Amino acid sequence: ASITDKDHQKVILVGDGAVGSSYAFAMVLQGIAQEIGIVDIFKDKTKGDAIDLSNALPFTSPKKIYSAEYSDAKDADLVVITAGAPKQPGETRLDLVNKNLKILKSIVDPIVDSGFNLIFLVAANPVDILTYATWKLSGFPKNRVVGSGTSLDTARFRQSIAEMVNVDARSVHAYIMGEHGDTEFPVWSHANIGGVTIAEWVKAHPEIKEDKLVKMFEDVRDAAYEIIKLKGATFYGIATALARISKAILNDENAVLPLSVYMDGQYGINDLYIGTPAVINRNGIQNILEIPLTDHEEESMQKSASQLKKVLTDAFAKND
Amino acid sequence: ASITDKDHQKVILVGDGAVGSSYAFAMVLQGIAQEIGIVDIFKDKTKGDAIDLSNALPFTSPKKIYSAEYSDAKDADLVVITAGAPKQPGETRLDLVNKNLKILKSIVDPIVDSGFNLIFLVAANPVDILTYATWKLSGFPKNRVVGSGTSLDTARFRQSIAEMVNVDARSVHAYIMGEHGDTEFPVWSHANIGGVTIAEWVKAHPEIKEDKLVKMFEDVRDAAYEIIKLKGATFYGIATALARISKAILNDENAVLPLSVYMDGQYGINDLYIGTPAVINRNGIQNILEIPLTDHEEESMQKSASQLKKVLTDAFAKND
Amino acid sequence: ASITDKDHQKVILVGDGAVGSSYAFAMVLQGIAQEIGIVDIFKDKTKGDAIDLSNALPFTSPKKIYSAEYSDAKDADLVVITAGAPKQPGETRLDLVNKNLKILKSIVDPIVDSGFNLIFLVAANPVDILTYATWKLSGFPKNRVVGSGTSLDTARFRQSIAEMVNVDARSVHAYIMGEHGDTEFPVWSHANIGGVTIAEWVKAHPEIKEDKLVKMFEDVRDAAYEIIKLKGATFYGIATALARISKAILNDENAVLPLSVYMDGQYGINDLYIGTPAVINRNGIQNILEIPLTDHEEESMQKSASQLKKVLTDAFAKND
Amino acid sequence: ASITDKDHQKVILVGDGAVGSSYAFAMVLQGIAQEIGIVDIFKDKTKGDAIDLSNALPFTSPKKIYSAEYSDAKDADLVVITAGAPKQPGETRLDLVNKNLKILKSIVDPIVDSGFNLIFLVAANPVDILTYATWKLSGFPKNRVVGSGTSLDTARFRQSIAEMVNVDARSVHAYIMGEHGDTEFPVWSHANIGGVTIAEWVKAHPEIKEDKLVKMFEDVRDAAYEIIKLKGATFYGIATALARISKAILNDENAVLPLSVYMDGQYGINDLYIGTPAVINRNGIQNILEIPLTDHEEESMQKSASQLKKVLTDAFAKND
């Protein structure tokens, strides 16, 4: 069997800026890519980041890394629109959803005409808003548009529930839901290490009336800002997440991960993107786990998912 | 060869809540995904969990992680409906099978219309019930609907048969069968470390009339509840299982794993989903190993698989 | 879903001699192959090298390894023509390009008729010459014919820029360009460890007028010959490179690697194969990074790429 | 904290011939060594095999590889006497135990004087005989002298019990015991895939009176000879085993592996080395699992372990 291009995986990066360059480096070492295409409106930083990354191969599982546009854009198995991103930070704001939504067109339309047929994976803030955005333009169904969000707020959470105690991460379970900052509510009602559970039977009850808890998610959600100093680089933690997430869909792991899905009354919030522990495989997401939120984390959810449906509604008015 | 989207793996997570966010993190690091799409009825927690996970990439094998709906839902190679989950806990109850079964429609129908053609991987409790559920709506054959179950009760079991002795996990063999809690019966009749076997030749016989055994599965099946305290987070152990399981189908490993399959008189229980050590590869499951259950673990099985066929029957009555 | 052959990766080795047997061993352990087919004009060394490699599986990610010909030659995802090699050594000589070019026909034609549709990956010296050769017969486009070259001269370079200092490899950046021996010029003008740079700001300027440098590439390019003694085995270093490279295309990593690409005025050398830091993914290569060579490494390039265009021209005269 | 040599692992290879060069290549890629020292009575093949292996590092976890003698011989964490080997093949013969036993002195004494304090790992045939040999000279206790043997006869066995059926290796359990060829007896009485068992309940009983079985260990133990043709290279399968085994002791995995241990009435064979499924960790072996051999595999054992105690006795008469 003859003339070639042995891939049978493809991934397209749409930002060889920070997050992207890192997503790249990981995808190179963790070894989850069989040809990687790197875009962003420059070309210089991409012939550079390639002749580096591609040098960084005799110590890793081989591929080919280039620089793209959107011709080399089909043959893909994943597309990652990693910080196809505007400038007003995050905390699902209002008019942010504008300054993107044309640099979300300028790059969603031509990765479609060539013959996309995969999963989009938009980690480009504000996320929840965005993946609804990335949905509506693409025509692409209620899963192939995978969001992101939650992933990098739980990973944090975990590793403060961590260091408090001794237990390794990857043991230690608990989520975050809603969006990404300013809304979030830790599902403490789940919260476990080792099959245990924090404060129903053992560590006792409330949050604010005891001295101890909560404090450490008043510095998980604030934990971006606190490194929107020393570089600006909330850029590792995320890229290393877009890799877990990306290895999961594509390796076909029938995994478990929080990521802004599409909500059909897999709560009662419906027709936003906001997110939750869902299950992702090659095709896209298949089945969204829903959570007894107690009575309070039900509220907290209900008033996240409301504050989108106002930034999601004042903006899906396309004609730039 | 031109315009792009190098994937050739795809995974769709349907709950970027707890289990999902974790399934995600793993799939990012263990490196089994080539584009991951993250859903759940929010959008906020998903643009968040993405711009984290996708940051968490320069230290891992690259992809793209987004937020979905069900358009970006084909191109998939796996779908993981990870805690597409209602609120009454687990122990295959009765009416539980209702409060889901519409948030199992609200998310099974649109991951079908786009053109799903893969394996479903529902880890969304109660499992056994559910994957029959996920079967009947999908039309999708008696394997492509992979269940879950058993996996996270054997992994526990193993690691108490473990710590008792010294032997590493991954040595140490023994299963659990039936469902998930309140029915289970450890196949002690298999039970080995090192090619040995526990209590036919060496460690002597019965269970309850000696002092020693059993006790430690009276705290494997109870081992969920005991961390339905300290968080609620029976959320790591599982996600790390949906990864083994997910790497297996998709990497095409012709593996061995317990997971709620479909029973044709691969016992005599037939036409539930309940489960057993079966064998899974890219396509789906191919061949279900059946076990000389002795005379007692035959009974125990027979009366698990009965207690579904009453929760499975009082509920498959679809029209919400 | 029924009757089987779960692969969805395929790799065909066209030399179960040295380099090949090693490429094999790696591909077995690093775990980048889902069925491997092994050829070379014998059959004995291949039923041998298989019933070894295939034994070397309970400690690795499973597949199937056989012995081929060119019927079992489609279904492939990569073909590696690993030392489809004649006897006059390397340093892109002249008439070498003859003694191959019929054992490059004897094996390129029948891996085409069966229905090849992938990437060729020829690491069979002289390389640059060869992949133009492997191109012209195949009809297969300007990427699916991936070369090799450069990879194993940079990896060396790196690990002398290394041991001098302390810094690990995989940190340490710098390339080699041109071909493979006797032409090469290290892009010192890039050359960095840690974001630093060697001798523009810190370590001062020239090469030959100071005492120190250069010396250690007068023993990188000579570093083949110096192990064309103690065995002849310039056979590990390379095979471990065909693995990085091979994992890259196929895993779809949108990577960065030097490998003889095809030059369209991605310099001004055009219509040879000579090479540079390019970017490779499943499909083939997508986008070739080009380098400000300064004023001298521009010359050095220009007079590599000239010395082919004389061995490339005196020989593409096919009719054996 | 100052002036350096960050290792905290050390491994010494005592044959940079075939098996060794391979053990090396693996230890380089699987990444289980933090400085490797390579010996064998040459020096040429070792400066060669190093300036290859050490080139084969920008695609792997860094170390330092040299060429030794026995000064650079302490600081070690393991010593592997990999084919410190004479010429009459294997099948624990008689006088073989002579032609070694002085090239087992010529190399055991000086890796002792420097201040060895670890595990010996002799995979140098005949093994069983040898590790008793390597014991008696060293003074080193009844575990730190780890043998080898069995490992590469079970791995084979497994992968014929395999290919017959579909199940991946690493599932599939069953051992081999005794020595290494011409004595061996498969513990079929254990023999399982998936928790099942071959021929007590399902596949029916005897061996020779049915047509089917046995045949495929009449070509596991003969499976060396059959590649003592096509090269001679029973050299991969083994080296990839000395890696599993070596990662196990040193990573401290409290693992399970067959390897010629020391038998105290962990049967009734006592005071040979012959072997069985034992358990190995950093220090050495801790606890040897013993097996209900039925009534026949008891005999077969008893008459392996007898045929040493005649080659082990006619030779431990040291004074060359």
Ligand SMILES: O=P(O)(O)OC[C@H]1O[C@@](O)(COP(=O)(O)O)[C@@H](O)[C@@H]1O
């Ligand atoms: O688990 P390790 O120690 O690597 O043993 C590997 C070999 O051991 C076996 O004898 C089976 O061991 P387990 O049943 O405890 O997993 C053989 O089938 C494997 O190839």
Ligand SMILES: O=P(O)(O)OC[C@H]1O[C@@](O)(COP(=O)(O)O)[C@@H](O)[C@@H]1O
């Ligand atoms: O080998 P996989 O498919 O990963 O199964 C993992 C689990 O399976 C087991 O039930 C034992 O499987 P094997 O005896 O074939 O190795 C449980 O002990 C493990 O944790």
